[PDB]
Amino acid sequence: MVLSEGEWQLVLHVWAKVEADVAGHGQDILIRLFKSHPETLEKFDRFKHLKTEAEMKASEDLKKHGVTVLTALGAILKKKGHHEAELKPLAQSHATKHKIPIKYLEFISEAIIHVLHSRHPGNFGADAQGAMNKALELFRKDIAAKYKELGYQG
Ligand code: HEM
Ligand SMILES: O=N[O-]
Ligand SMILES: O=N[O-]
Ligand SMILES: O=N[O-]
Ligand SMILES: O=N[O-]
Ligand SMILES: O=N[O-]
Ligand SMILES: O=N[O-]
Ligand SMILES: O=N[O-]
Structure with missing residues (x-):
């Protein structure tokens, strides 16, 4: 669950290349x-x-x-x-507005990782993909908890 700073730096180093375009x-x-x-x-x-x-x-x-x-x-x-x-x-x-199940949040997480893997092999080797997966898992875990608080089963 909680990422190390080293993991966040791998996440933000590939994100820096996303931000070029x-x-x-x-x-x-x-x-x-x-x-x-x-x-x-x-x-x-x-x-x-x-x-x-x-x-x-x-x-x-x-x-x-x-x-x-x-x-x-x-x-x-x-x-x-x-x-x-x-x-x-x-x-x-x-x-509440869009009704996006957690399973679809998993699908878009898979699409993000596929695209970064294809575009950014210089910054998305196995350790970096592992760190991004952990960040996206954290995001989905925290969104799932908020969904439950908001009444939506997800
Ligand atoms: C990384 C996960 C995602 C992020 C960060 C994200 C972010 C956003 C943001 C910022 C908006 C505009 C503001 C809003 O309505 O909240 C939006 C709209 C929307 N999102 Fe997402 N979203 C995510 C995943 C998904 C997925 C997986 C679906 C559907 C399978 C989805 C369906 C929509 C819909 C239907 C809209 C309204 C689009 C429109 O304006 O026509 N989102 N999302
Ligand atoms: O301290 N790197 O996970
Ligand atoms: O977040 N700019 O569309
Ligand atoms: O439609 N946004 O709460
Ligand atoms: O709104 N997520 O495409
Ligand atoms: O887009 N998923 O491989
Ligand atoms: O992706 N091989 O570290
Ligand atoms: O940090 N969870 O919303």
Whole structure:
């Protein structure tokens, strides 16, 4: 559960490379999630009509969304676990407005790791992927606890 500082530094070193082009990494991650787990795309009323990866790549609104998502996760990871304030509104919206089960949070965690593994082998070898997995597990564990407080079974 609690990450060491060395683990957080591996997380934030690969995140630094994401931040060279957040919009590009958000397209790759959302696309990989929708292609790997098509049922997740059904949660997005604004995007669920998109039929192909081409359409998804060409969607200016999907790209803006990817930037929103990754910048919110970035701000969470930069808290190195002290993320209670940031998780409150995110848990509430994803529980009550969007109804995102923890299993779908696991799917997007898998999509993040796939994309960083593909793009960043210089900063995402086994130890670094292990540290990112632990950070994402922590995030899901803390969101699951907030979901239960908010009444949503997740
Ligand atoms: C790393 C995990 C995730 C983060 C950091 C994240 C972040 C965000 C943020 C910041 C927003 C905009 C503000 C809000 O409504 O809260 C948003 C909207 C949304 N999220 Fe997520 N999200 C995550 C995972 C998911 C997953 C896995 C799904 C669905 C399978 C999902 C579905 C949505 C929907 C449907 C919206 C509204 C999109 C729209 O404006 O049309 N989220 N998310
Ligand atoms: O102290 N590195 O986990
Ligand atoms: O869309 N900027 O977080
Ligand atoms: O794509 N997460 O909103
Ligand atoms: O730190 N949990 O919200
Ligand atoms: O609580 N956000 O929809
Ligand atoms: O996107 N999951 O390998
Ligand atoms: O990824 N080999 O450390």
